[PDB]
Enzyme design. Structure first.
Site, mmCIF file in Angstrom:
data_model
loop_
_atom_site.group_PDB
_atom_site.id
_atom_site.type_symbol
_atom_site.label_atom_id
_atom_site.label_comp_id
_atom_site.label_asym_id
_atom_site.label_seq_id
_atom_site.Cartn_x
_atom_site.Cartn_y
_atom_site.Cartn_z
ATOM 1 C CG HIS J 61 -56.225 -4.736 65.994
ATOM 2 N ND1 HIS J 61 -57.422 -4.460 66.381
ATOM 3 C CD2 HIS J 61 -55.307 -3.745 66.163
ATOM 4 C CE1 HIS J 61 -57.297 -3.287 66.837
ATOM 5 N NE2 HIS J 61 -56.136 -2.719 66.666
ATOM 6 C CG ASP J 91 -80.404 5.422 45.516
ATOM 7 O OD1 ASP J 91 -79.640 5.057 45.299
ATOM 8 O OD2 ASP J 91 -81.456 4.779 46.120
ATOM 9 C CD1 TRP J 126 -50.933 -1.589 59.457
ATOM 10 C CD2 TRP J 126 -52.222 -1.128 57.787
ATOM 11 N NE1 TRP J 126 -50.898 -0.551 59.583
ATOM 12 C CE2 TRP J 126 -51.656 0.090 58.343
ATOM 13 C CE3 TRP J 126 -53.285 -1.153 56.762
ATOM 14 C CZ2 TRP J 126 -51.923 1.260 57.914
ATOM 15 C CZ3 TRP J 126 -53.580 -0.037 56.093
ATOM 16 C CH2 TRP J 126 -52.975 1.149 56.806
ATOM 17 C CB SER J 156 -65.629 -2.825 47.827
ATOM 18 O OG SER J 156 -66.629 -1.854 48.473
ATOM 19 C CB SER J 157 -62.890 1.466 48.332
ATOM 20 O OG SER J 157 -63.359 1.374 49.652
ATOM 21 C CG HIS J 240 -50.340 10.311 54.921
ATOM 22 N ND1 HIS J 240 -49.880 10.323 56.083
ATOM 23 C CD2 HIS J 240 -51.240 11.398 54.725
ATOM 24 C CE1 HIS J 240 -50.560 11.245 56.845
ATOM 25 N NE2 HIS J 240 -51.442 12.036 55.845
ATOM 26 C CD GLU J 242 -57.536 3.790 54.080
ATOM 27 O OE1 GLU J 242 -58.383 3.066 54.928
ATOM 28 O OE2 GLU J 242 -57.652 4.124 52.910
ATOM 29 C CE1 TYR J 244 -54.272 13.809 57.380
ATOM 30 C CE2 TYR J 244 -52.679 12.547 56.125
ATOM 31 C CZ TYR J 244 -52.953 13.599 56.982
ATOM 32 O OH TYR J 244 -51.755 13.986 57.906
ATOM 33 C CB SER J 255 -68.906 19.989 60.368
ATOM 34 O OG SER J 255 -67.410 20.272 60.404
ATOM 35 C CG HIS J 290 -44.831 10.846 57.402
ATOM 36 N ND1 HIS J 290 -45.734 11.914 57.190
ATOM 37 C CD2 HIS J 290 -45.769 9.767 57.686
ATOM 38 C CE1 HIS J 290 -46.970 11.792 57.075
ATOM 39 N NE2 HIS J 290 -46.972 10.641 57.343
ATOM 40 C CG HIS J 291 -45.904 6.106 56.713
ATOM 41 N ND1 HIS J 291 -46.699 6.017 58.291
ATOM 42 C CD2 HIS J 291 -46.651 7.188 56.279
ATOM 43 C CE1 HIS J 291 -47.720 6.595 58.004
ATOM 44 N NE2 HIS J 291 -47.851 7.538 57.068
ATOM 45 C CB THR J 316 -55.524 20.025 60.783
ATOM 46 O OG1 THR J 316 -55.121 19.362 59.564
ATOM 47 C CG2 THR J 316 -56.259 19.031 61.745
ATOM 48 C CE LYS J 319 -62.357 20.000 58.511
ATOM 49 N NZ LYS J 319 -63.515 20.802 57.804
ATOM 50 N NE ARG J 438 -46.179 -0.088 64.851
ATOM 51 C CZ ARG J 438 -47.031 0.452 63.698
ATOM 52 N NH1 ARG J 438 -46.459 1.575 63.458
ATOM 53 N NH2 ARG J 438 -47.915 -0.175 63.362
HETATM 54 C C1 HEA Z 1 -57.039 9.465 61.173
HETATM 55 C C2 HEA Z 1 -55.792 8.937 60.917
HETATM 56 C C3 HEA Z 1 -54.493 9.847 61.059
HETATM 57 C C4 HEA Z 1 -54.423 11.069 61.122
HETATM 58 C C5 HEA Z 1 -55.546 12.291 60.618
HETATM 59 C C6 HEA Z 1 -53.104 11.314 61.113
HETATM 60 C C7 HEA Z 1 -52.441 12.490 61.159
HETATM 61 C C8 HEA Z 1 -50.993 12.999 61.249
HETATM 62 N N1 HEA Z 1 -50.334 12.140 61.581
HETATM 63 FE FE1 HEA Z 1 -50.409 10.045 61.610
HETATM 64 N N2 HEA Z 1 -50.590 7.979 61.515
HETATM 65 C C9 HEA Z 1 -51.590 7.186 61.376
HETATM 66 C C10 HEA Z 1 -53.082 7.921 61.301
HETATM 67 C C11 HEA Z 1 -53.362 9.256 61.208
HETATM 68 N N3 HEA Z 1 -52.442 10.020 61.470
HETATM 69 C C12 HEA Z 1 -51.628 5.844 61.360
HETATM 70 C C13 HEA Z 1 -52.469 4.641 61.290
HETATM 71 C C14 HEA Z 1 -50.108 5.760 61.205
HETATM 72 C C15 HEA Z 1 -49.275 4.694 61.330
HETATM 73 C C16 HEA Z 1 -49.582 3.316 60.666
HETATM 74 C C17 HEA Z 1 -48.541 2.257 60.844
HETATM 75 O O1 HEA Z 1 -47.107 2.334 61.046
HETATM 76 O O2 HEA Z 1 -49.010 0.954 61.148
HETATM 77 C C18 HEA Z 1 -49.676 7.126 61.517
HETATM 78 C C19 HEA Z 1 -48.327 7.489 61.580
HETATM 79 C C20 HEA Z 1 -47.709 8.940 61.182
HETATM 80 C C21 HEA Z 1 -46.249 9.019 61.215
HETATM 81 C C22 HEA Z 1 -45.154 7.752 60.978
HETATM 82 C C23 HEA Z 1 -44.693 7.573 62.284
HETATM 83 C C24 HEA Z 1 -43.496 6.322 62.300
HETATM 84 O O3 HEA Z 1 -44.279 5.305 61.963
HETATM 85 O O4 HEA Z 1 -42.440 6.381 62.545
HETATM 86 C C25 HEA Z 1 -46.098 10.437 60.972
HETATM 87 C C26 HEA Z 1 -44.719 10.931 60.763
HETATM 88 O O5 HEA Z 1 -44.788 12.220 60.575
HETATM 89 C C27 HEA Z 1 -47.656 10.737 61.329
HETATM 90 C C28 HEA Z 1 -47.817 12.378 61.310
HETATM 91 C C29 HEA Z 1 -49.198 12.803 61.323
HETATM 92 C C30 HEA Z 1 -49.363 14.217 61.057
HETATM 93 C C31 HEA Z 1 -48.358 15.132 61.271
HETATM 94 C C32 HEA Z 1 -50.817 14.369 61.251
HETATM 95 C C33 HEA Z 1 -51.476 15.658 60.769
HETATM 96 O O6 HEA Z 1 -52.450 15.524 60.083
HETATM 97 C C34 HEA Z 1 -52.151 15.990 62.092
HETATM 98 C C35 HEA Z 1 -52.617 17.600 62.079
HETATM 99 C C36 HEA Z 1 -53.614 18.078 63.343
HETATM 100 C C37 HEA Z 1 -53.113 18.637 64.490
HETATM 101 C C38 HEA Z 1 -51.610 19.243 64.527
HETATM 102 C C39 HEA Z 1 -53.865 19.035 65.358
HETATM 103 C C40 HEA Z 1 -55.026 19.915 65.462
HETATM 104 C C41 HEA Z 1 -54.355 21.477 65.053
HETATM 105 C C42 HEA Z 1 -54.239 22.461 66.048
HETATM 106 C C43 HEA Z 1 -54.992 22.735 67.089
HETATM 107 C C44 HEA Z 1 -53.647 23.824 65.135
HETATM 108 C C45 HEA Z 1 -52.447 24.234 65.910
HETATM 109 C C46 HEA Z 1 -51.315 22.947 65.772
HETATM 110 C C47 HEA Z 1 -49.941 23.468 65.604
HETATM 111 C C48 HEA Z 1 -49.471 24.636 65.124
HETATM 112 C C49 HEA Z 1 -49.125 22.089 65.390
HETATM 113 N N4 HEA Z 1 -48.297 9.796 61.551
HETATM 114 CU CU LIG Z 2 -48.670 9.167 56.988
#
Ligand code: HEA
Ligand SMILES: [Cu+2]
Ligand SMILES: CCCCCCCCCCCCCCCCCC(=O)OC[C@H](COP(=O)([O-])OCC(O)COP(=O)([O-])OC[C@@H](COC(=O)CCCCCCCCCCCCCCCCC)OC(=O)CCCCCCCCCCCCCCCCC)OC(=O)CCCCCCCCCCCCCCCCC
Ligand SMILES: CCCCC/C=C\C/C=C\C/C=C\C/C=C\CCCC(=O)O[C@H](COC(=O)CCCCCCCCCCCCCCCCC)COP(=O)(O)OCCN
Ligand SMILES: CCCCCC/C=C\CCCCCCCCCC(=O)O[C@H](COC(=O)CCCCCCCCCCCCCCC)COP(=O)(O)OC[C@@H](O)CO
Ligand SMILES: CCCCCCCCCCOCCO[C@H]1O[C@H](CO)[C@@H](O)[C@H](O)[C@@H]1O
Ligand SMILES: CCCCCCCCCCOCCO[C@H]1O[C@H](CO)[C@@H](O)[C@H](O)[C@@H]1O
Ligand code: CUA
Ligand code: NA
Ligand SMILES: [Zn+2]
Lengths: 102, 44, 55, 40, 75, 49, 72, 136, 254, 514, 91, 227, 70
Positions: J61, J91, J126, J156-157, J240, J242, J244, J255, J290-291, J316, J319, J438
């Site tokens: 998945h 192009d 995964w 590819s990427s 990580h 990835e 982003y 935007s 943090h993972h 963030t 934006k 999970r």
């Molecule tokens: C689109 C994909 C994407 C994005 C952008 C992010 C964004 C972030 N993620 Fe996430 N995350 C994943 C996809 C993503 N996550 C995936 C796939 C996993 C796990 C994979 C797995 O284990 O299989 C994961 C797991 C993951 C973990 C690990 C948890 C664990 O496994 O125990 C953590 C820990 O810190 C984390 C944190 C964050 C943080 C801090 C952001 C930050 O970038 C977010 C920032 C945005 C905001 C905060 C909101 C907007 C902001 C405002 C409105 C401003 C004001 C806000 C404040 C002052 C707080 N994410």
């Molecule tokens: Cu991460």
């Protein structure tokens, strides 16, 4: 100032040989601003329409004054009151007088 | 090459029923594939 | 060795409609066919091995 | 965006057919499999 | 002796090296004491600490390897 | 000139809402789904030992 | 220019490589076969190699590389 | 597609071209008339001038619609259809659940959970009256 | 067209390349699990064929057809730099593996680095010769570059020959050092990090030597001008990359 | 002509089209897998009667949605179609290499499908952590086929990243600086940088796993002095960046969409939007651990990673506030794409904030490897990326096809999807807080209600996906050809018509340097 | 010694066209940014083209990040819809 | 353990889990602060016929749009880091216990004095006694003294597992070749349940952890009787 | 005659007031959570433990048969 912005715009629309491109650019630019234009700008715009033989754009200009007012329903009636001598003198009918508000 | 609407695509949109059949085979093969994988594995 | 770049320039700029990968002439077409045939036939074989390994 | 009238309008009937065929293309194969899990 | 005390050499969640070092120290201590007619019983402290901390299978495997001549730690 | 929404809007809204509520309620209550809700204020404890 | 780099190539680079070559192909011979001890962290076999009899590394040298059970 | 075109947009009140490009006989006569006093044009002629220049008025282009009813209603029908899939799933895909969901099991289990004081500060046993031997 | 960029003729090589990747990978799988090398040989063959015809076509498009305008050349410059950067990061992972293991040797190793029972190569023996060899080849290729820019055919060919010979010497030396080594890839993480890191590096020496050889033959056939020779510059950048990676390996992993 | 055009392409639009078709197909596979996960969990007990299969399904998945649906749609699809148009380039820089980036993906997908067809599949997650993914606990070909699938996708990427960076730096009009390119172009360049740096590290780690499995290396095997935790660092060093990479092009399209349907000629605070994406790109490389807050890391390391991870909210937030400020003063057009974008902004924010919760390593002790994480990333990643994709797809469909969609049907589709995804995932927070792990095929009985609801939500989203297929058919079936598009003066991609001709900008744009 | 061809001797196709045109101070393949005139009705920016229309981008003020794009057609000079500066096609 | 329809954390059993409850409340309040500010601002943006489409000056907001979020993060990070370092402060435990993960069960070793050890398997559903918990109970529970600091050391003999007990605030990965430490302290007697929290193959769902917390005297009695 | 109303800066004015409102509401909503949830939690813990008797709790669990060890 407010005063200086107004006078630039009045002066703009008053150009005796203002052309059609210039009239459209003027009005389209002006409605981008956070403001309903002052009577004396609209007055000057209407008279350009006259010099340009453009009755339809005169009507459209009054619609866009109303539109820019939003929910503040006192600004259109008011601007119309202030424009009546010009409306009378140039034979510019309002949107309401034309049924263009229904 | 052909240019314009319906012409810049590797599938035909000349007839909407034949398109329907092609889209259905296309997306439905993708959607069905996991279920047949699962079947495959359980049958092992 | 002598500089024959001018001859290859005339050959590869000949206004004959061929794409660059075939424009050297007959042996291009051969190498292309061998390449594509191995690729496709190899891909068939790989699908065969998949079917075999799947059971 | 503005557009010209449909060159080949799709009537409500035709949409109901399109929609039904679409949905059955997802739902029949998966349902076959899920219904028969026990069998596997 | 109740259990192994906190040891500032090993302050972290990974305690692998604490188990390892105390297993090594038991055997180094016994060697040094038995070579010099000293009191072997002093080394018991390290045995108590490694017995508390080390997984039984780690102790068992390391013991088997010492018997085999394949224990890779220096004693 | 009246559009699709002027002609069929209230009918779509009314019957869609009605269908949705009826079919979900029936699914929730009539086909033996065990939701496993809280026992709090609902279940009488019973001797287990 | 080219003359500088040619100078460096014949004056510094190739002479350095000649001296290292002489020193390696004089201080070669072959040295003592290390004694075998069947350490569990060495001669790892978790799956048979995909060549030979499965138990010989790719550049296996009978002289200095023991198998898990010792020298051949 | 490269030519200037017409739009009805409330922040672009005077678009790049007129709504009606090619004028009939009388329409051209009307444009000629526009060059003399507008007091001399009728109400109908002023509207006709309007509609040569523009497609929709401000009121028309800003009109409200009933589309929300179609969207919300249709969404609700699709959501309802989903529940039919779920009934079909529950009937034909799912077998029985584990025996631990039987009413008697749940009753015994609940007692045992109170006996071990599961979540006694807030979550669960907190909600059981141990003096009165009932839920609070 | 009145821009200076290159609209490339429709080409089969991307598809044969992608299928060659499928065949190499399913081939390796067949080799590791099903004891057969046929698929893998077919993939290697198709990969080589694709690489040859694809790069052949790039020479056709540039030397022979005149499509490499300065803007096009500038693009290729960026592309090669970025390609090299991706390879550097690839190697970074193996350096990370090496330091991970070596700076925190586990109990199975004896708690020490090098591990108990491992007799490391002496870096002042053949690995010093390897070092002199690649450094000297960085010196010779720079001479070759300057000879080319100055219009000097003979000296470009001499310098480039010397460079290639040095890369081949490094490769034979490393093959012999692999044979002679008393530890193997299977000698725990010491063997793993040593042979995989130096092994990939050796693969890159082979690749870069091949690239220099192609440049050699193109220079023999007069393809390069004193001002336009990007295939040569790219081969030199790649070769300097190969030199720098060796230097890091030499300092770190030995 | 068909082979020449569609198999031997050197055309950024046709390649873009290929990617969209592949990505849409992959999305069907990934949705089916998701439905299988949720059907296993839809009532207590066992549906599949085989947890190895469950694990295989979960793993596939994820790879399908990430590597075959989102990345090809955002970077291969929208990237190829739009980027050249948006800078008036004829192009991509390497239009033939571009084609191989496309053609590597079907075989990559074939390797993955092969992995699940042979032996008992790769039931690893995964993340593919050893020793579970090694040769004793996953003997046989499946894991190797998975590794190879990832190598091919990786290549590819990487080549795609080279192509986009080169194109975006080198192929603008000579008067246009980089700070006069649209935001979607920036977002693609930054994503490309992240791919170029991160994928080779993944390639290194998975190659080491390959050699541990088949050549008797011990990078991850304690018996050899290796460490399973090393594999985790290398995986998440990639992983990580990835996440982003998965959202950045969505930021870009959002935007553009918010700007357009607000009636504005430009987004609010262009420089800050560029600065924010660059900042997120950079910070995205220094947070990976943090993972790994439960693997037994030193306290100062846990403090650092907690802190650094939270910093990402600052750029963030810039934006998010700038999107709101684009809306500010707008003539708001409630088009279907505008709905997708507004849904994105809200749902992305919620997922972002649960990310900030997880950044706290102390609380992450209790939330790690529970459904709270699954909720987090299905909000930010699943819904955020998917809403941006839907938004972009609705918004640009007329450019790509020359045909209009039925706006009412598109709004209905949005509404059903919005209900579906919230019903599926919002309750997963409760499941997580309350301790449901999970990667589980079944759960203690207490967790039955939230799982039941979640599974019900999954079927609603199924209904939306089926409707989406119908909506695309209807557009192609009715053939309403585009007439006028507004705001072309600040949306260059539209100015060559719908669809644009095979070759655009044969004559480049004229732009003065004054 | 010599033996290495020069561009003058061996550059061909478009590379050669670009090289020879640059010598003469001409830019037929649009490598350089055209320099603005005052852009008035009397001194319009002269926009070369090989057809009867070409897309102009106008950067109205230096360091605007927004570029204003429009088709310029053969015939009377046209004005940027943002800033009004004048542009005239010369096919 | 968890209970039906539960929304947040299991009730705290240890001081550290109580801290985490309060810190989670503090952080979720901030989540709600932010999300409600955004939703309110979005609908504000979307609810007026007034327009301003000309170019807007972006520099005026630079400071508040970065400074106020920075301050909010600090307000999260301070208590976050205090708890991090407090959790880490010197453990002087009275007892050490080890647990080893296996496919698919846990073993336990208490080897401070005697060599006590045993396996702990999930009770299959068909063998549960009346009122016992599906997928949670084990045959041999981890008997521990209440009101004492306990060092738990965690490893594995095969693949990764992870030893978790939500109510005590514990989750420590079980990694072969590595010995990870956590400390455990229960304020109360009782039974506290957890489940393996690293995917370890086909029975990952089916290898739980049950702590049984009792006074020291009953722990010593049990210890002696499990020899 | 109608008096002259404000004609400039209407959007800006709406924003200046409504931003203050936004901050008030959002602070109110968050402080409601703190009150209804966090303060209730603090109180429920302090009250539970203020005279908690762990041995008595233990004896009741023992009497009910829950333990393997007693
Ligand atoms: C689109 C994909 C994407 C994005 C952008 C992010 C964004 C972030 N993620 Fe996430 N995350 C994943 C996809 C993503 N996550 C995936 C796939 C996993 C796990 C994979 C797995 O284990 O299989 C994961 C797991 C993951 C973990 C690990 C948890 C664990 O496994 O125990 C953590 C820990 O810190 C984390 C944190 C964050 C943080 C801090 C952001 C930050 O970038 C977010 C920032 C945005 C905001 C905060 C909101 C907007 C902001 C405002 C409105 C401003 C004001 C806000 C404040 C002052 C707080 N994410
Ligand atoms: Cu991460
Ligand atoms: C599991 C492994 C991974 C698989 C990944 C699968 C998905 C990848 C898809 C990527 C797309 C690849 C397309 C490559 C070229 C396609 C060639 C082909 O097969 O033709 C059949 C078909 C054409 O049908 P048609 O309409 O009759 O065409 C007439 C042509 O005009 C005129 O045609 P002609 O007369 O000139 O040529 C006739 C003939 C002979 O001519 C040729 O020479 C071509 C023959 C060789 C082509 C081989 C292509 C193989 C590609 C492999 C990809 C994998 O070619 C054929 O039509 C017959 C070939 C049949 C081969 C079957 C493979 C189909 C594609 C893959 C489907 C995936 C199923 C996987 C199986 C899974 C089971 C578990 O084209 C397609 O199938 C494309 C997909 C179907 C279209 C669905 C439409 C959905 C629209 C959604 C919109 C969203 C995008 C929005 C953008 C829109 C605006 C721009
Ligand atoms: C080729 C380069 C690297 C491949 C991996 C390992 C080879 C490392 C270098 C080498 O050649 O190592 C040798 C072992 O080779 C061996 O296993 C040889 C194994 C031969 C098969 C090659 C491995 C096949 C797997 C290739 C994976 C490649 C993945 C690349 C993806 C790139 C990312 C985009 C060392 O010999 P040995 O007898 O153990 O010890 C010496 C004793 N006298
Ligand atoms: C024992 C078995 C040995 C087998 C090993 C085989 C492996 C690899 C093969 C080695 C690489 C060969 C590359 C040849 C490229 C030739 C084409 C070329 O060099 O093309 C040039 C452009 O550069 C360009 O494309 C630049 C193109 C750059 C190509 C980059 C090459 C490196 C890629 C290596 C792949 C890495 C694999 C990694 C594994 C982890 C053409 O422009 P110029 O040179 O300016 O000429 C024009 C003038 O004549 C005008 O006056
Ligand atoms: C992606 C492409 C990767 C390509 C990898 C190619 C690897 C080629 C492997 C060939 O190895 C064959 C086996 O050779 C090994 O075993 C043989 C005995 O069986 C010996 O004779 C050889 O000297 C060698 O030790
Ligand atoms: C730059 C890094 C060095 C890599 C160079 C690779 C090129 C050398 C390939 C030849 O390798 C074969 C090893 O073969 C040696 O040992 C094998 C096993 O005992 C034998 O089968 C062979 O007969 C040979 O004696
Ligand atoms: Cu053991 Cu999961
Ligand atoms: Na289940
Ligand atoms: Zn301008």
């Amino acid at each position: 100032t407010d005063e200086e912005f107004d006078a630039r715009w009045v002066t703009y629309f008053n150009k005796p040989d203002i052309d059609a491109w210039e009239l459209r650019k003027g009005m389209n630019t002006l409605v981008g601003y956070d403001l309903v234009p002052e009577p004396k700008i609209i007055d000057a715009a209407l008279r350009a329409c006259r010099r340009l033989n453009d009755f339809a754009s005169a009507v459209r200009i009054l619609e866009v004054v109303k539109d820019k007012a939003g929910p503040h329903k006192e600004i259109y009636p008011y601007v119309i009151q202030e424009l009546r001598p010009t409306l009378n003198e140039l034979g510019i009918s309002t949107p309401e007088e034309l049924g263009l508000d229904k | 090459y052909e240019e314009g609407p319906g012409k810049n695509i590797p599938f035909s949109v000349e007839n909407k029923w034949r398109l329907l059949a092609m889209m259905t085979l296309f997306f439905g093969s993708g959607f069905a594939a996991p279920f047949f994988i699962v079947r495959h594995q359980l049958l092992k | 060795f002598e500089n024959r770049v001018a001859e290859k320039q005339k050959l590869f700029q000949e206004d004959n409609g061929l794409p660059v990968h075939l424009k050297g002439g007959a042996t291009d077409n051969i190498l292309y066919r061998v390449t594509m045939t191995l690729c496709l036939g190899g891909t068939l074989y790989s699908l065969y091995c998949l079917g075999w390994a799947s059971f | 965006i503005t557009a010209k009238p449909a060159k080949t309008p799709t009537s409500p009937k035709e949409q109901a057919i399109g929609l039904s065929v679409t949905f059955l293309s997802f739902l029949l194969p998966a349902g076959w499999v899920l219904y028969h899990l026990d069998n596997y | 002796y109740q259990t192994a005390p906190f040891d500032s050499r090993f302050p972290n969640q990974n305690q692998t090296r604490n188990c390892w070092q105390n297993y090594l120290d038991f055997h180094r201590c016994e060697k040094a004491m038995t070579a010099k007619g000293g009191d072997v019983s002093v080394c018991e402290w390290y045995r108590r600490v490694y017995k508390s901390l080390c997984p039984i299978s780690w102790v068992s495997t390391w013991d088997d390897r010492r018997a085999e001549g394949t224990f890779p730690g220096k004693i | 000139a009246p559009d699709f929404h002027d002609k069929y809007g209230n009918a779509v809204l009314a019957s869609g809402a009605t269908f949705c509520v009826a079919v979900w309620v029936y699914m929730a209550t009539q086909i033996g789904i065990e939701w496993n809700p809280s026992p709090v204020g609902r279940v009488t404890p019973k001797e287990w030992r | 220019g080219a003359r500088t780099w040619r100078f460096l190539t014949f004056g510094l680079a190739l002479p350095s490589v000649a001296l290292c070559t002489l020193n390696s192909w004089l201080h070669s011979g072959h040295r003592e076969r290390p004694a075998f001890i069947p350490y569990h962290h060495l001669r790892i076999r978790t799956k048979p190699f995909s060549w030979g009899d499965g138990n010989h590394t790719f550049f296996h040298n009978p002289r200095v590389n023991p198998l898990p059970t010792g020298y051949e | 597609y490269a030519l200037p075109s017409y739009v009805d947009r409330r922040d672009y009140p005077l678009p790049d071209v007129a709504h009606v490009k090619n004028l009939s006989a009388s329409q051209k006569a009307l444009k000629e008339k526009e060059k003399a006093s507008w007091s001399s044009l009728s109400i109908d002629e002023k509207v006709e001038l309007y509609r040569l220049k523009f497609k929709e008025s401000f009121a028309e282009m800003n009109r409200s619609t009933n589309e929300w009813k179609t969207v919300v209603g249709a969404a609700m029908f699709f959501i309802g259809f989903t529940a039919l899939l779920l009934i079909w799933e529950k009937h034909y895909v799912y077998g029985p659940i584990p025996h631990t969901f039987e009413e008697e099991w749940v009753a015994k289990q609940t007692k045992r959970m109170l006996d071990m004081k599961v979540a006694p500060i807030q979550g669960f046993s907190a909600k059981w009256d141990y003096d009165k031997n009932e839920w609070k | 067209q009145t821009h200076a960029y290159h609209m490339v003729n429709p080409s089969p090589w991307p598809l044969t390349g992608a299928l060659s990747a499928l065949l190499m990978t399913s081939g390796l799988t067949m080799w590791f699990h099903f004891n057969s090398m046929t698929l893998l040989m077919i993939g290697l063959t198709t990969n080589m064929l694709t690489m040859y015809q694809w790069w052949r076509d790039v020479i056709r498009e540039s030397t022979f057809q005149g499509h490499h305008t300065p803007a096009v050349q500038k693009g290729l410059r960026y592309g090669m730099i970025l390609f090299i950067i991706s390879e550097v990061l690839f190697f970074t992972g193996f350096f990370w593996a090496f330091y991970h293991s070596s700076l925190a040797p586990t109990p199975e190793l004896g708690g020490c680095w090098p591990p108990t029972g491992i007799h490391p190569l002496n870096p002042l023996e053949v690995p010093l010769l390897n070092t002199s060899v690649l450094l000297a080849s960085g010196v010779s290729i720079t001479w070759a570059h300057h000879s080319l820019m100055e219009g000097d055919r003979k000296h470009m060919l001499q310098a480039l020959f010397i460079t290639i010979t040095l890369g081949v010497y490094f490769t034979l030396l490393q093959a012999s050092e692999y044979y002679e080594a008393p530890f193997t890839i299977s000698d725990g993480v010491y063997g793993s990090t040593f042979f995989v890191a130096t092994g990939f590096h050796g693969l890159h020496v082979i690749i870069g030597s091949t690239f220099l050889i192609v440049c050699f033959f193109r220079q023999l056939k007069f393809h390069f001008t004193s001002n336009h020779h990007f295939g040569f510059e790219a081969a030199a950048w790649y070769w300097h990359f190969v030199d720098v990676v060796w230097l890091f390996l030499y300092v770190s992993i030995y | 002509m068909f082979i020449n055009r569609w198999l031997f392409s050197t055309n950024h639009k046709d390649i873009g089209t290929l990617y969209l078709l592949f990505g849409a197909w992959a999305g069907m596979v990934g949705t089916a897998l998701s439905l299988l996960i949720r059907a296993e969990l839809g009532q207590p007990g066992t549906l599949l009667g085989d947890d190895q299969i469950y694990n295989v399904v979960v793993t596939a998945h994820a790879f399908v949605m990430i590597f075959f649906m989102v990345m090809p749609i955002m970077i291969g699809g929208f990237g190829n179609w739009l980027v050249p148009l948006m800078i008036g380039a004829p192009d991509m820089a390497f239009p033939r290499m571009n084609n191989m980036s496309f053609w590597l993906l079907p075989p990559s997908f074939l390797l993955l499908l092969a992995s699940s067809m042979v032996e008992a599949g790769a039931g690893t997650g995964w993340t593919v952590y050893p020793p579970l993914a090694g040769n004793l606990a996953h003997a046989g070909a499946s894991v190797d086929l998975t590794i190879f699938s990832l190598h091919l996708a990786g290549v590819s990427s990487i080549l795609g990243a080279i192509n986009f960076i080169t194109t975006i730096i080198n192929m603008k009009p000579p008067a246009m600086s980089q700070y006069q390119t649209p935001l979607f172009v920036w977002s693609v360049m930054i994503t490309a940088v992240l791919l170029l740096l991160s994928l080779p590290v993944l390639a290194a780690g998975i190659t080491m796993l390959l050699t541990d499995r088949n050549l008797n290396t011990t990078f991850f095997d304690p018996a050899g002095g290796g460490d399973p935790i090393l594999y985790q660092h290398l995986f998440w060093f990639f992983g990580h960046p990835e996440v982003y990479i998965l959202i950045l092009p969505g930021f870009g399209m959002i935007s553009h969409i918010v700007t357009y349907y607000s009636g504005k000629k430009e987004p609010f605070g262009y420089m800050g939007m560029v600065w924010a994406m660059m900042s997120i790109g950079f910070l995205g490389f220094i947070v990976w651990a943090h993972h790994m807050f439960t693997v037994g890391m030193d306290v100062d390391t846990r403090a650092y990673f907690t802190s650094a991870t939270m910093i990402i909210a600052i750029p963030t937030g810039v934006k998010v506030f700038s999107w709101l400020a684009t809306l500010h003063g707008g003539n708001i057009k409630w088009s279907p794409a505008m709905m997708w974008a507004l849904g994105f902004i809200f749902l992305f924010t919620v997922g972002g904030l649960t990310g900030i919760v997880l950044a706290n390593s102390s609380l992450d002790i209790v939330l790690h490897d529970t459904y709270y994480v699954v909720a987090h990333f299905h909000y930010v990643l699943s819904m955020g990326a998917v809403f941006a994709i839907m938004g972009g797809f609705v918004h640009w469909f007329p450019l790509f096809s020359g045909y209009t969609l039925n706006d009412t049907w598109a709004k209905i589709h949005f509404a059903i999807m919005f209900v579906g995804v919230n019903m599926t995932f919002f309750p997963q927070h409760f499941l997580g807080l309350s301790g449901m792990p999970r990667r589980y095929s079944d759960y203690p009985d207490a967790y039955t209600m939230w799982n039941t609801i979640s599974s019900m939500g999954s079927f609603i989203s199924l209904t939306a996906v089926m409707l989406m297929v119908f909506i695309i058919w209807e557009a192609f079936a009715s053939k309403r050809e585009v007439l006028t598009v507004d705001l072309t003066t600040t949306n260059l991609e539209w100015l060559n018509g719908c669809p644009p001709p095979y070759h655009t900008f044969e004559e480049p744009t004229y732009v003065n340097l004054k | 010694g010599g033996g290495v061809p020069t561009d003058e001797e061996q550059a061909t196709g478009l590379e050669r066209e670009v090289m020879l045109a640059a010598r003469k101070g001409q830019d037929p393949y649009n490598i350089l940014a055209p320099k603005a005139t005052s852009g008035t009705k009397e001194d319009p920016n002269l926009v070369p083209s090989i057809t009867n229309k070409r897309i102009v981008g106008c950067i109205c003020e230096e360091d605007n990040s927004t570029v204003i794009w429009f088709w310029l057609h053969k015939g009377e000079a046209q004005r940027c819809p943002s800033c009004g500066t004048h542009y005239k096609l010369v096919p | 353990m968890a209970y039906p329809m539960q929304l947040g954390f299991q009730d705290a059993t240890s001081p550290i889990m109580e801290e985490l409850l309060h810190f989670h409340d503090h952080t979720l309040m901030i989540v709600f602060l932010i999300s409600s500010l955004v939703l309110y601002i979005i609908s504000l943006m979307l609810t007026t016929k007034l327009t301003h489409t000309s170019t807007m000056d972006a520099q005026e907001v630079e400071t508040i749009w970065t400074i106020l979020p920075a301050i909010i993060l600090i307000l999260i990070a301070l208590p976050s880091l205090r708890i991090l370092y407090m959790m880490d402060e010197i453990n002087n435990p009275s007892l050490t216990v080890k647990t080893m993960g296996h496919q698919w069960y846990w073993s336990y070793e208490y080897t401070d004095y005697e060599d006590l050890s045993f396996d702990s398997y999930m009770i299959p559903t068909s063998e549960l006694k009346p009122g016992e918990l599906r997928l949670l109970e084990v045959d041999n529970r981890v008997v521990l003294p209440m009101e004492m600091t306990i060092r738990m050391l965690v490893s594995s003999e095969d693949v990764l597992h992870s030893w978790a007990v939500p109510s005590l605030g514990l989750k420590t990965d079980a990694i072969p070749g590595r010995l990870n430490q956590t400390t455990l302290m229960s304020s109360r007697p009782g039974l506290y349940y957890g489940q393996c929290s690293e995917i370890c193959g086909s029975n990952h769902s089916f290898m739980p952890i049950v702590l049984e917390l009792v006074p020291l005297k009953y722990f010593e009695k049990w210890s002696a009787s499990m020899l | 005659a109608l008096a002259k109303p404000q004609m400039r800066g209407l959007l800006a004015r709406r924003l200046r007031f409504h931003i203050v409102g936004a901050f008030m509401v959002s602070l109110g909503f968050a402080t409601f959570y703190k009150f209804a949830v966090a303060e209730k939690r603090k109180k429920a813990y302090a009250d539970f433990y203020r005279n908690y008797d762990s041995m008595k709790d233990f004896e009741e669990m023992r009497k009910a048969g829950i333990f393997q060890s007693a």
